[PDB]
Design a protein around this ligand. Structure first.
Ligand SMILES: [Mg+2]
Ligand SMILES: [Zn+2]
Ligand SMILES: [Zn+2]
Lengths: 325, 50, 1327
RNA sequence: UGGGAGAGGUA
């Protein structure tokens, strides 16, 4: 149990003893769940129109010959013409959006043709955190609406979630809240000018997205559940191979660093191997994870082991000259 | 008197208590306790007078 | 730079960020290509200042013209490089960790504040179990330590109302959410309903802790380290080696560990790591921070690369090799030398021979100054090279500089204060410091390879200290006892003994001489020896009433040697000074008499002249040792053969089977002890009086001129035990198991031991050599503890005007006089008068220093006991007055105000630790029918007073003992007056008549049995632990009545004549008989240095003596239990007191009499705490002084009692308060006794009730730790605990101690600095 | 030059 133990690596081995080892087949299913979360987050960020205009303008920036051809495209004269016809598809869906199921089928066809573009992960993070910060803008907006309707009038919350959470684009709900002959609705006149500020702020959101609040709420809700599923699958993949980290770092013990620092940096390398693992090459998990764990442990003991720090390229150079001469 | 004080029941409970004395804070099990009590005294490499 | 106080407190994160100059964000210290420090590293120039004087890193700003600027290229501020050891950094910790001092130094202060167990707090900090901070529901309260399963249950159950966090951040949030004044008020209400002992102590501990936080202004969130500060990089330096490799400090390694794990925690919090990984990293950062603050404290100590544990900050400050005791108290010191010491007997008393080269190296800047003054060197470089070339003008300038410029000769270990003395140096050619032979009794230095340090005072004030205070002609008398330590030792003593001894018919006996000059002329011409008994004319000068000298001239029957020393003895001493054979004690008395008569300057020239003549005549003597001079007594083999025959006779009696083995063993030891005593006595006889071949009267006898007996009788080197081992018998040697071996070493060191006797002797030799090392370590530890208690004691006032005192009676325990009244009282100041008629009616007034003339008057009029003012009873705040202490023992007059007493007292006590008519008083008796008087009291002492009034001996009689002599009877010596039963304790009576056998029946309280010798039945009262159910409620009584049966009363009182006898009583007296008065009724049966250290540490012994806490009669109140309770009720009021006594311990006082305040109820050693609390301050002072002096007189060392009284006064500094008045003391707070005296003085000045108190004898360790100065306490011992308590309570230091001003660097308030400190104190008061 | 361990020795 939790007794008088004082070694932290013994408590680490106790807290890692609760999980079980992985079988021959199970990590392919965990990697399939990881790739399902990645496919879910990609297919929910696909149909966002301002992200499509962002990738076209970054393609105009790379075609204006001042940026390199490596920091925005990884793979799949070919990308140029397919982005040109994506731009043709963009300028025809800018005016066939007015007409109504034709708009839905054309934006989903733009979504499925978007899936070929293998974008860079740093700009994937740019797309995800840009969706997150516009969601933070509208969330503190609705938190401000929530705060102003609870602070002054002490009203129940069933009428608010049936009236405010409808369209919330025009003023059809605010006048309905005044016109239901309640003794606080006649004293919601001093709240009126900054909630009109809030309403024109929502209209600012409608012109910078193009779609309403409900569609982008559904888009970021799909974003959130896909991110949570992929992160939980990645977390379950991480806490099943810690014994591999202690098996690798068992040999690097008396190299100038503590034993617990080694398995901690091995856990960092294990996370970096989980995030960039491909299951389609037939290998299970260990032949790909061992290289990253060994790299993280070696780069830990090559830097944080001495006061006078020698870089790794200089120590292999002087080692090569020591072995030849 | 030592048997009346002794709170263990049988061999596996005795090995669990010896495990809890020697390596405290670790969750004991049967094979680790058996291997620990064998290799403390009755192993030719971890015990020698000779 | 002129600060009044050093305030310590806890450090807020805002204050730590205010100290720092930049966040350290990289573990790597410096580079490897070029060695410039990094950016945001552990040695960085932008954070910790520039590396060179007035230079940046890139080289842009490179002069003092740009005085202070910031470089826009590399950030390095252009200043001096001194700010590399004054600027701190700070590490911004991701998870706020807990301080290991305010968590692990017991009491934990976090468990004592949050009221949570330390194991549960450690489980929270180790991330093993969640803790809940706040919860709206009634299921989860505050501080309910949940497990992982319970938290996962509560998360799916409520999930919204409660907030439970895990780790040190949870404890930070808990200390944030708690309310100090609310918890203090709730515990103040909680203390009032009921008071169990453990609950009240825990509650008052928590209340004192919470009140300390509120009154200091600290906040409880500050114990959780959020921002960790960084030591400056020239205080954790980076020093190289000679082979290019670096050898850094361990602090750089620990700082690298903390920075790396903190950076990894930031990376893991940004990378969205799993919960197990980020929790382990938070635990690693906590472990690394706790290791850096105190490595060996929390768990396994983090070891370095060479398998040794690293040195943390707490290990840099605390310990034997810590900052305090290695650099702050004792520092290394420039202008210092060291060499072997030899003997210079051609010197004077104030001179020493420095070598030429060593003093040239010592006085080098002084030679630079005189060279540039006399124009022989233009510049300092020319003067440096002229000294380094060692020219003749440099030697002449050095001879001019060193003239009248005293240097201090120190020799380690400096036990007492005479181990440093100042000498006017005389330049000699050689390499060894030539000391004077007289000062090597003060230095305890023999010339077997010793080494002495030479320190040079620089300033004019320092030269005047060494000339007026520390000159070797000033400190002649020892400060321990007022006797001269500049004394002839072994060689001057042998020479003066051979001079002033006299033979019988040596050469030219019976002449008449014109004086001392003609006697010296006769000896150096050779017509008369040094031992001729001759009549000389002596013109001695006596002293007048004033300073004049009258003379007398007559003929004295002297020797030639005494008439040679009369040329040496100055004018003012009588001839009885010189006219005996001068041993070491005799020459000590000569120098003491010359001091007290003449002063200091005749005493200095007398010591130099007596040393010169002692050395010269020991050289002219030729006193040699030989193998014919260790004369074995000719009757050694006969006594040894008789002793072996007697031992063999008892051995064959034991082999026959009559006497047991232990009695054979004791008989053999006693026989060999008697045989060794007889052989030693015959040896001493045949060595003392062997010279019998004489002439010119007849065959005459005299003391022998044997050299072994001469160097024994002179007191020069050795004693009669050493002469016994050389010539007589070696004696009985002991085994290392303590038991004396049966057969002794019969051979001596002249006949030579055999193999087995030498192997037996090696036991005691190695044991004595091992014991000596242990005592020196113990004595030095005892001396350090004694000094660190008695630091803060100095003379402040000239007189306090008190009326208290300690009545000094000569210690008269046993059959002899241990200390006379002269040794007890010479030096102190009389408190009251001496009211006795006597013969001359001496009446000394108060406030009179007892000189030798006044003590001679006291000896002549034979005063029994005089009351003098002591240091303990002094009424001066923060220091004592001069009149209570008395005489400065090193000088010989009254003590100057401002001189530190306590350091001298502690040194004088801890220095010999490497050497370690019938009178009845307090009676109640009755005359019996036969006149054989019996006593009915236990505290009766039998005083033996002479016919002049003074006391000769002292004896304590037992209760119920018989006595033949009354008061006023003068019995001769040798008469056995002490007659008493040693094993039985009687239950005697004082009335007569018949006995009524009431309240005892055969079967439940008494055992019916008979005696095996006479056949008469005897009624033994059965003890209550083995009685039946009928005897659990009765006490049997010997109801003594009159001749017919009425209840006789005690004459004087109203108590009926009953006698509740205890168990195990041999009741021989039956009913229906006649009983006299006073007869018996029944029979009731029954090192040196560790003792000094246990008396001064105030230890309760293994079996304390139970004492009576209130005066009155004593009765038993609780039944059916063996723990005997005493309801000791007073004879005037009600009883609020009871006492619990265990089973097996016996009792001295029965339940029918009345005891006084502080009566011995159970026998044994009495503990000094209850001695103080019941008897009084003067009684516990007298107990400690007598029991320390018993040890120091057993080993033979003279120490004045004022030093032990100083240590007792420094031990009694605390005074807990039992009842308050209007002062700011609530309940049971151990404040200083000087503070409550000042508070009571102010309260009785403005007219209020005042606050009473009760003092308590703390030990040496507890007093020096509970000293109000955290710097003095942390410099003594337990630096972690002292700094933790001071930081929590928010204390400050007022800088009033000698150790404090040694640490800080000011003049101490002791001696010369006292005038400056009182001027500074009056400047602070008047402004 | 400076720091830290280990061993030996002198008083
Ligand atoms: Mg010596
Ligand atoms: Zn610069
Ligand atoms: Zn006084």
């Amino acid at each position: 149990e939790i007794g008088r133990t004082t070694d932290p690596v013994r408590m680490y081995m106790r807290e890692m003893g609760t999980v079980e080892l992985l079988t021959r087949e199970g990590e392919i299913d965990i990697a399939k769940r990881i790739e399902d979360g990645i496919n879910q987050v990609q297919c929910s960020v696909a149909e966002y129109p301002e992200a499509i205009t962002y990738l076209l303008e970054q393609y105009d920036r790379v075609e204006a010959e001042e940026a390199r051809l490596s920091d925005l495209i990884t793979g799949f004269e070919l990308a140029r013409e397919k982005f040109a016809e994506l731009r043709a598809q963009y300028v025809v869906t800018r005016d066939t959006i007015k007409a109504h199921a034709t708009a839905q089928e054309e934006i989903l066809k733009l979504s499925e043709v978007f899936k070929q573009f293998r974008l860079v992960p740093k700009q994937f993070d740019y797309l995800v955190n840009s969706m997150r910060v516009m969601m933070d803008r509208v969330r503190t907006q609705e938190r401000l609406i929530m705060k102003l309707c609870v602070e002054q009038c002490k009203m129940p919350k069933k009428n608010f979630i049936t009236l405010f959470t409808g369209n919330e684009t025009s003023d059809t709900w605010f006048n309905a809240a005044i016109a239901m002959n309640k003794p606080w609705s006649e004293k919601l006149h001093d709240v009126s000018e900054e909630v009109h500020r809030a309403l024109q702020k929502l209209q600012q959101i409608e012109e910078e997205t193009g779609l309403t609040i409900e569609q982008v709420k559904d888009i970021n809700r799909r974003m959130s559940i896909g991110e949570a599923k992929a992160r939980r699958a990645k977390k379950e993949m991480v806490e099943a191979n810690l014994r591999l980290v202690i098996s690798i770092a068992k040999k690097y013990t008396n190299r100038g660093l503590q034993f617990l620092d080694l398995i901690q940096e091995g856990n960092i390398g294990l996370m970096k191997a989980v995030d960039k693992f491909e299951y389609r090459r037939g290998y299970k998990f260990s032949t790909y994870a061992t290289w990253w764990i060994r790299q993280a442990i070696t780069r830990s003991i090559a830097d944080q082991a001495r006061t006078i720090r020698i870089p790794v390229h200089m120590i292999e150079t002087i080692n090569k000259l020591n072995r030849i001469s | 008197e030592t048997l009346r004080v002794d709170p263990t029941n049988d061999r596996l409970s005795a090995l669990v208590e010896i495990y809890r004395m020697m390596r405290p804070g670790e969750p004991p099990t049967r094979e680790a306790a058996e291997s620990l009590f064998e290799n403390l005294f009755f192993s030719e490499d971890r015990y020698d007078l000779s | 730079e002129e600060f009044d106080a050093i305030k310590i407190a806890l450090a807020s994160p805002d204050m730590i960020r205010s100290w720092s100059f930049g966040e350290v964000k990289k573990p790597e210290t410096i580079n490897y290509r070029t060695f410039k420090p990094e950016r945001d590293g552990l040695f960085c120039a932008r954070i910790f200042g520039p590396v060179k004087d007035y230079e940046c890193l890139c080289g842009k700003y490179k002069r003092l013209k740009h005085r202070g600027v910031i470089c826009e290229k590399c950030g390095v501020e252009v200043t001096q490089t001194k700010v590399r050891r004054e600027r701190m950094g700070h590490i911004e910790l991701a998870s706020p960790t807990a301080h290991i001092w305010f968590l692990k130094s017991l009491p934990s202060r976090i468990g004592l504040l949050l009221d949570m167990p330390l194991r549960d707090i450690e489980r929270v900090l180790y991330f093993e179990s969640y803790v809940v901070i706040e919860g709206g529901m009634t299921n989860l309260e505050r501080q309910q330590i949940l497990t992982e399963e319970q938290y996962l249950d509560a998360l799916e159950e409520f999930g919204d109302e409660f907030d439970a966090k895990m780790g040190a951040e949870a404890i930070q949030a808990l200390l944030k959410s708690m309310d100090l004044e609310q918890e203090c008020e709730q515990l103040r209400e909680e203390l009032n309903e009921t008071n169990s002992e453990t609950k009240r102590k825990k509650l008052t501990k928590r209340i004192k802790l919470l009140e300390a936080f509120v009154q200091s202004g600290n906040k409880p969130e500050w114990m959780i380290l959020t921002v960790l500060p960084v030591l400056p990089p020239d205080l954790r330096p980076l020093v190289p080696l000679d082979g290019g490799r670096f050898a850094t400090s361990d602090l750089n390694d620990l700082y690298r560990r903390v920075i790396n794990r903190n950076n990894r925690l930031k990376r893991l919090l940004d990378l969205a790591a799993p919960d197990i990984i980020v929790r382990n990293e938070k635990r690693m950062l906590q472990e690394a921070v706790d290791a850096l603050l105190d490595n060996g404290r929390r768990g396994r100590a983090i070891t370095g690369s060479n398998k040794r544990p690293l040195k943390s900050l707490a290990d840099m400050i605390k310990g034997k090799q810590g900052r305090f005791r290695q650099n702050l108290l004792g520092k290394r010191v420039d202008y210092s030398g060291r060499s072997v010491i030899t003997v210079g007997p051609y010197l004077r008393l104030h001179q020493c021979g420095l070598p030429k080269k060593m003093a040239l190296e010592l006085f080098k800047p002084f030679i630079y100054g005189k060279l540039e003054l006399r124009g022989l060197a233009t510049t300092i470089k020319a003067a440096k090279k002229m000294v380094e070339r060692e020219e003749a003008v440099v030697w002449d300038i050095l001879d001019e500089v060193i003239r009248e410029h005293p240097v201090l000769l120190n020799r380690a270990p400096t036990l007492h204060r005479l181990g440093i003395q100042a000498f006017e140096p005389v330049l000699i050619e050689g390499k060894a410091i030539q000391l004077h032979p007289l000062v090597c009794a003060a230095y305890n230095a023999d010339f077997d390879g010793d080494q002495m340090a030479v320190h040079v005072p620089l300033t004019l004030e320092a030269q005047l200290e060494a000339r007026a205070l520390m000159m070797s002609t000033n400190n002649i008398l020892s400060p321990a006892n007022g006797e001269p330590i500049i004394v002839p030792s072994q060689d001057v003593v042998l020479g003066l003994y051979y001079m002033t001894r006299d033979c019988v018919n040596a050469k030219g006996e019976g002449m008449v001489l014109t004086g001392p000059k003609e006697a010296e002329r006769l000896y150096r011409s050779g017509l008369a020896s040094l031992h001729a008994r001759v009549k000389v004319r002596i013109t001695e000068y006596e002293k007048d009433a004033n300073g004049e000298l009258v003379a007398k001239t007559s003929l004295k029957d002297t020797t030639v040697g005494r008439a040679i020393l009369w040329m040496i003895v100055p004018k003012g001493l009588p001839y009885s000074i010189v006219n005996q054979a001068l041993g070491k004690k005799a020459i000590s008395k000569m120098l003491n008499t010359c001091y007290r008569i003449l002063g200091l300057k005749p005493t200095v020239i007398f010591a130099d002249q007596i040393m010169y003549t002692g050395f010269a005549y020991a050289a002219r003597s030729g006193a040699s040792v030989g193998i014919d001079d260790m004369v074995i007594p000719e009757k050694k083999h006969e006594i040894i053969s008789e002793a072996e025959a007697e031992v063999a006779e008892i051995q064959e009696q034991f082999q026959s089977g009559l006497v047991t083995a232990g009695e054979r063993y004791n008989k053999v030891i006693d026989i060999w002890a008697a045989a060794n005593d007889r052989v030693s006595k015959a040896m001493m006889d045949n060595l003392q009086t062997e010279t019998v071949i004489n002439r010119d009267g007849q065959e005459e006898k005299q003391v022998s001129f044997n050299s072994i007996y001469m160097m024994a009788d002179s007191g020069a080197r050795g004693s009669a035990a050493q002469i016994r081992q050389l010539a007589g018998m070696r004696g009985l040697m002991a085994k290392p198991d303590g038991s004396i071996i049966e057969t002794p070493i019969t051979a001596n060191f002249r006949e030579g031991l055999n193999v087995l006797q030498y192997f037996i002797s090696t036991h005691g030799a190695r044991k004595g050599l091992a014991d000596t090392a242990l005592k020196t370590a113990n004595s030095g530890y005892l001396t350090r503890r004694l000094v660190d208690v008695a630091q803060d004691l100095v003379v402040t006032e000239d007189d306090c005007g008190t009326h208290e005192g300690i009545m000094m009676t000569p210690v008269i325990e046993g059959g002899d006089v241990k200390e006379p009244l002269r040794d007890r009282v010479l030096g102190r100041v009389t408190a009251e008068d001496v009211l006795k008629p006597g013969t001359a009616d001496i009446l000394v007034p108060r406030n009179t220093l007892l000189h030798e003339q006044w003590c001679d008057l006291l000896e002549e009029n034979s005063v029994d006991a005089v009351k003098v003012r002591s240091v303990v009873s002094c009424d001066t705040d923060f220091g004592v007055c001069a009149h209570c202490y008395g005489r400065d023992l090193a000088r010989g007059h009254i003590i100057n105000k401002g001189e530190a007493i306590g350091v001298i007292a502690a040194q004088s006590i801890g220095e010999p630790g490497t050497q370690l008519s019938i009178k009845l008083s307090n009676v109640k008796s009755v005359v019996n029918s036969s006149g054989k008087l019996v006593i009915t009291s236990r505290n009766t002492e039998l005083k033996l007073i002479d016919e002049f009034g003074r006391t000769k001996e002292s004896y304590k009689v037992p209760y119920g003992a018989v006595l033949a002599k009354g008061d006023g009877e003068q019995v001769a010596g040798g008469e056995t007056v002490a007659n008493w039963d040693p094993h039985t304790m009687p239950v005697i009576t004082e009335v007569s008549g018949f006995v009524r056998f009431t309240d005892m029946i055969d079967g439940q309280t008494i055992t019916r049995q008979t005696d095996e010798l006479t056949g008469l039945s005897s009624l033994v009262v059965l003890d209550s632990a083995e009685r039946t159910a009928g005897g659990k409620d009765l006490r049997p009584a010997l109801k003594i009545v009159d001749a017919q049966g009425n209840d006789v009363l005690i004459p004087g009182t109203d108590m009926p004549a009953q006698y509740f006898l205890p168990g195990k009583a041999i009741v021989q007296l039956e009913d229906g008989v006649q009983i006299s008065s006073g007869d018996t009724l029944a029979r009731i049966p029954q090192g040196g240095l560790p003792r000094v250290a246990d008396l001064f540490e105030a230890r309760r012994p293994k079996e304390p003596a139970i004492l009576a806490e209130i005066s009155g009669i004593v009765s038993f109140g609780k039944e059916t239990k063996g723990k005997r309770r005493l309801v000791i009720t007073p004879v005037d009021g009600s009883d609020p007191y009871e006492e619990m006594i265990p089973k097996w311990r016996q009792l001295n006082v029965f339940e029918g009499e009345r005891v006084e305040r502080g009566d011995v109820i159970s026998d044994g050693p009495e503990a000094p705490h209850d001695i103080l609390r019941l008897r009084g301050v003067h009684a516990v002072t007298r107990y400690i002084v007598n029991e320390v002096q018993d040890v120091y007189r057993l080993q033979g060392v003279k120490i004045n009692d004022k030093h032990i009284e100083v240590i007792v006064r420094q031990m009694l500094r605390k005074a807990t308060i039992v009842n308050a008045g209007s002062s700011d003391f609530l309940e049971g707070e151990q404040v200083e006794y000087s503070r409550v005296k000042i508070a009571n003085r102010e309260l009785e000045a403005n007219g209020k009730v005042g606050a009473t108190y009760s003092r308590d004898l703390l030990g040496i360790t507890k007093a020096s730790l509970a000293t109000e100065s955290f710097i003095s306490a942390a410099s003594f011992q337990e630096t972690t605990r002292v700094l933790t308590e001071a930081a929590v309570a928010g204390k400050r230091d007022e800088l009033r101690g000698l150790k404090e001003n040694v640490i800080v660097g000011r003049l101490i308030p002791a001696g010369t600095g006292y005038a400056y400190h009182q001027d500074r104190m009056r400047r602070r008061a008047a402004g």
